[PDB]
Design a protein around this nucleic acid. Structure first.
Ligand SMILES: [Mg+2]
Ligand SMILES: [Mg+2]
Ligand SMILES: [Mg+2]
Ligand SMILES: [Mg+2]
Ligand SMILES: [Mg+2]
Ligand SMILES: [Mg+2]
Ligand SMILES: [Mg+2]
Ligand SMILES: [Mg+2]
Lengths: 110, 141, 262, 131, 42, 185
RNA sequence: GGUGACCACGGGUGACGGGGAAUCAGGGUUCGAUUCCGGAGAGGGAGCCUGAGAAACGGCUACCACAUCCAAGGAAGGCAGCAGGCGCGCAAAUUACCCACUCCCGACCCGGGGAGGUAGUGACGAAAAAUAACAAUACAGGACUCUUUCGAGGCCCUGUAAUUGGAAUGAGUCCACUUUAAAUCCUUCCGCGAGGAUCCAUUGGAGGGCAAGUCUGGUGCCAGCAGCCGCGGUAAUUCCAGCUCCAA
């Protein structure tokens, strides 16, 4: 907490600093599912894909801005096939890619 | 072994200088043949005039045409070959221009796959080559 | 060089003058006189740097040209006149009557003496010779030539002369047990009592001196100026009495002084 | 002017130049650097004299305002102050108005005079022809 | 000269031109170092 | 020919290996936790400490009761005590060898202004000094690297002219007040 | 006769010597044209006058090499002084103001000094040190907890914000003082001077050595990169670009 840290730094020091995990680097593709859960899990056996509503939203928002799948994919720095797979209800959703699409087309996907 | 005597300083020092002549760097720096042979004459840069634009084939296993120029220096008018580094920078250099020429990095040694080229072009007629490449300035026309 | 030099660079000046660095390229360059260049103090720096009666050289020049500055009783108007050791500077408009003697750091100290003391000075005999018609002469550590001295006076003894007559009043011999001041070298300005003089023919004689605290030191015979008969000086010693303090005890004295006044 | 104080340290009277010299401290906590005119009339009131024998110079003010340090001399009379004092300080409050020309002009005049010999009329009229 | 130097500057000419994006200026000096410290340590 | 001095020296030294992960992390911790501007200030402080340690080592190699060892050791210890990086009980050269640059960085004026409660948030303490709000005893100081002595420690205060001590509020408050009273009665 | 393997003699030096400078365990290796001291020279050699002092060059004579004026009979030269020009080159400043300072010279308190000082140009280099601070709402990210991820916030950070609310300050513009020989600069201080505070931080890099992307578009052993290992023949972590990161 900022208040307690600045309170401790104006007097006798007991603060502890430590480095973050992914600090000082750019991981271009952030992982979507926690591998601690994914290595642990043995029972549940399914992945939920994107809904058809989400693909329709992407389709209508992209088409209403004179924008193609190639241009949207280049704009958000992804391959065209992942856009065509998001629009066709085939790809497992990635929140980071979804957020890039939302800032690209100005709609809300979650 | 070596002599360790208390009065052996002359033997030690004479042996050391006689044996100092046996390494490449001391002889290169202290003989004067290398200073006379290199076209810059101990300078770090030199000015010259472009004679023609040539392309040298890269050494194997690389395969390209490295765009160079043939330059004749203004002082001591030797003829050297200088690299023209970047993707399109040869088109900036026109025939009979007056370039500045630097070393190419390894103190008179050839660098990379370019065979026998020891120099690179910096500042074709006085506008610098980096500013020309980056669009900062243009040829004084 | 095709002839004599007339300039003096600032960092080439004598160290005991305590000239700084940034205020000029040149140093005052003492004129020829009765004292050597490295062993003198020209009037300009005594009047400007030590007493601060002036701020520039022009002010020194006009207070000299008003013809009240007296060195050894004569009016000197040359602002680069070499004042030198054991010499009496009398202002006698303000009425100061200084005398030039070294302190224990080897530097010419400001030393005010009484008007009755300013009548005389001590000179060190550097030569005795017989002139034409068989009359003897002596030459002091100044350029003074005294005719008809006492026949008991020998070389490297001191004589007390009085000013404005130039006559010899009294003298003491260079003998073991007499008070001396060192006038050159590492022990410059120290005062002690002569204990030994061992001779080296051809070379220089070294004289061993013991001060009041028993710190014995040696120096060459040319850097010895006897100043008193056995233990009592014939002039007024400056503050500190020629006793050299070590840096540690001088630091302690400085700390005690700043604690008393602070 | 209500809150401006003058302090003097390292005071000394020297009869060699017939003056009293001293270092002046000026305290102006909110104002700009004080002009030398009211400094010297304050010194006139302070040492019971007139502000004609008072010369102040070299006033440098500290970082952050407040203190200013400079020097001053107080003369016994104005004839001495004209006698022994730099002429630029006599000029600063006008008692000595010099009109000298450029030193280039003096040097060229001198070399031209050097070129003509001897005769008083020619050596004086050398600066009459090339004007 | 063999005339093989005819295609100098080829790829840098073929490359489609993409304009820079307008982004807000970066902090400099102590503030940049503070921002850098705050995202690497707690 | 000229009355210049030309005497100068560098006050820092660069590290031998660039891009060492541990060193980069440590000096970034020092920068962030003490509100410094660049790595050069860290390097300047550790250069100062290294020179002190070199003097202390050379004195430690000398013999005890040597006059030079006594004189310069006492002077060095007195100096480090008067700037507050060393205690009075620890008056030996070994404790000089035990010092760290976090002791020197604490004695800066910026750190003192933040730790005296005179300004929150050490980055605010830097800009408060650099805008001439702070004075050691009566002197206005805008130098964040001023090293505060123990004696001049109780006299750190806002300056008498800033709008945190005496009056005369700044140009922003004056401008807002005058436009408010120009817009009102 | 004298000298020489304890290196004479000869040759080279991109050699003026030294105090010193860079490097930095201890040893050492390089550098010193360059403000202090000593030497030497005044285009090249030579010879002199005067004087205490010169084999003087802001003295003279002669020859050699350059070179100026001429009415063609003659005459006058010496920047390795301060500026300034040409040339040479990778490579270096104003044909500025003043004797106020520091000192020197003189018949001399008074005259003179491109010695020297002052300003100009100046990222050689060295010191200090801005480009934001504080507060609050949104949005995503991160070890969280209130039920177990779902909903939160009693929580805590950290953010990219052209979302505010109002304080603080220079950088500039500029009155005056001060500075100074006269000015300038700094310093002091009126009055204006910040919300994309557009009053805009840049050079290099992101395979390894070596901190930082297998992100996207293009090219296709080409163009190019690459100190070195190497990369590129149609899915390039290395080229050309955009975005995002790293170092100072
Ligand atoms: Mg053996
Ligand atoms: Mg030579
Ligand atoms: Mg030398
Ligand atoms: Mg010399
Ligand atoms: Mg000569
Ligand atoms: Mg000659
Ligand atoms: Mg800026
Ligand atoms: Mg790239």
């Amino acid at each position: 907490s900022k208040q307690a840290i600045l309170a401790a730094q104006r007097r006798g020091e007991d603060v502890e600093t430590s480095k973050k995990w992914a600090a000082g680097q750019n991981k271009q593709h952030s992982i979507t599912k926690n591998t601690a859960k994914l290595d642990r899990e043995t029972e549940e056996l399914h992945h939920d894909r994107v809904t058809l509503e989400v693909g329709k939203v992407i389709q209508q928002g992209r088409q209403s801005k004179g924008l193609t799948q190639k241009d949207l994919a280049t704009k958000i720095n992804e391959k065209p096939q992942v856009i065509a797979d998001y629009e066709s209800g085939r790809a497992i959703p990635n929140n980071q890619v979804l957020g890039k699409i939302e800032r690209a087309i100005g709609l809300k996907l979650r | 072994g070596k002599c360790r005597g208390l009065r052996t300083a002359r033997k030690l020092r004479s042996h050391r200088r006689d044996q100092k002549w046996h390494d490449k760097q001391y002889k290169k720096a202290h003989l004067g043949t290398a200073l006379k042979a290199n076209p810059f004459g101990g300078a770090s840069h030199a000015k010259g005039i472009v004679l023609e634009k040539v392309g040298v084939e890269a050494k194997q296993p690389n395969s390209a045409i490295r765009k160079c120029v043939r330059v004749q220096l203004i002082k001591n008018g030797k003829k050297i070959t200088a690299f023209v580094p970047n993707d399109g920078c040869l088109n900036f250099i026109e025939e009979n221009d007056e370039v500045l020429v630097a070393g190419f990095g390894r103190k008179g040694h050839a660098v990379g796959d370019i065979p026998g080229v020891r120099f690179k072009v910096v500042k074709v007629a006085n506008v610098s080559l980096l500013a020309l490449y980056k669009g900062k300035k243009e040829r004084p026309r | 060089a095709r002839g004599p030099k007339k300039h003096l660079k600032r960092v080439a000046a004598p160290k005991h003058w305590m000239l700084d660095k940034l205020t000029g390229v040149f140093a005052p360059r003492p004129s020829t006189g009765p004292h050597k260049l490295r062993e003198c103090l020209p009037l300009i720096i005594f009047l400007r740097n030590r007493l601060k009666y002036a701020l520039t050289g022009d002010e020194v020049k006009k207070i000299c040209m008003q013809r009240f500055i007296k060195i050894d009783g004569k009016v000197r108007t040359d602002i680069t006149y070499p004042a030198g050791f054991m010499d009496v500077i009398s202002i006698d408009k303000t009425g100061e009557n200084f005398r030039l003697i070294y302190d224990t750091k080897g530097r010419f100290a400001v030393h005010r003496i009484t008007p009755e003391e300013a009548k005389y000075k001590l000179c060190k005999v550097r030569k005795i010779f017989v002139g034409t018609k068989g009359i003897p002469h002596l030459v002091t550590h100044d350029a003074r030539t005294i005719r008809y001295p006492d026949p008991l006076i020998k070389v490297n003894d001191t004589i007390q002369i009085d000013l404005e007559t130039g006559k010899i009043t009294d003298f003491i011999k260079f003998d073991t047990g007499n008070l001396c001041m060192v006038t050159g070298g590492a022990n410059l300005g120290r005062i002690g009592v002569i204990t030994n003089r061992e001779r080296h023919p051809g070379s220089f004689d070294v004289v061993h001196v013991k001060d009041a605290n028993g710190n014995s030191f040696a120096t060459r015979l040319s850097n010895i100026f006897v100043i008193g008969k056995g233990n009592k000086p014939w002039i007024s010693l400056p503050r500190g009495k020629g006793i050299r303090l070590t840096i540690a005890e001088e630091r302690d004295k400085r700390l005690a002084a700043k604690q008393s006044s602070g | 002017n209500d809150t401006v104080t003058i302090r003097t340290r390292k005071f000394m009277t020297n009869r060699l130049l017939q003056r009293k010299q001293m270092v002046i401290d000026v305290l102006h906590p909110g104002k700009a650097t004080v002009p030398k005119t009211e400094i010297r009339e304050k010194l006139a009131k302070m040492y019971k004299t007139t502000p004609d024998v008072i010369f102040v110079f070299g006033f440098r003010t500290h970082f952050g305002g407040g203190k200013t340090t400079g020097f001053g001399m107080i003369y016994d009379s104005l004839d001495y102050a004209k006698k022994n004092e730099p002429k630029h300080r006599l000029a600063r409050h006008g008692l000595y108005e010099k009109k000298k020309t450029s030193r280039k002009q003096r040097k060229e005049r001198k070399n031209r005079m050097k070129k003509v010999r001897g005769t008083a009329k020619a050596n004086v009229g050398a600066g009459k022809k090339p004007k | 000269v063999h005339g093989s130097l005819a295609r100098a500057g080829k790829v840098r000419g073929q490359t489609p031109k993409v304009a820079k994006q307008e982004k807000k200026k970066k902090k400099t000096g102590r503030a940049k170092r503070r921002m850098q410290y705050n995202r690497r340590f707690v | 020919p000229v009355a210049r001095s030309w005497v100068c020296r560098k006050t820092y030294v660069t590290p031998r290996r660039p891009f060492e992960k541990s060193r980069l992390d440590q000096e970034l911790k020092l920068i962030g936790e003490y509100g410094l501007r660049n790595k050069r200030e860290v390097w300047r402080v550790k250069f100062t400490l290294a020179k002190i340690r070199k003097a202390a080592r050379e004195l430690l190699t000398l013999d005890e009761k040597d006059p030079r060892r006594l004189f310069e050791g006492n002077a060095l210890l007195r100096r480090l005590v008067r700037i507050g990086v060393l205690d009075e009980g620890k008056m030996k050269l070994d404790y000089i060898l035990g010092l760290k640059i976090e002791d020197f960085l604490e004695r800066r004026l910026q750190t003192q202004v933040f730790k005296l409660g005179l300004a929150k948030s050490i980055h605010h303490a830097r800009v408060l000094i650099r805008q001439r709000h702070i004075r050691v005893r009566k002197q206005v100081v805008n130098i964040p690297s001023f090293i505060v002595r123990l004696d001049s420690q109780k006299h750190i205060d806002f300056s008498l002219r800033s709008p945190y001590g005496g009056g005369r509020p700044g140009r922003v408050k004056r401008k807002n007040a005058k436009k408010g009273q120009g817009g009102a009665g």
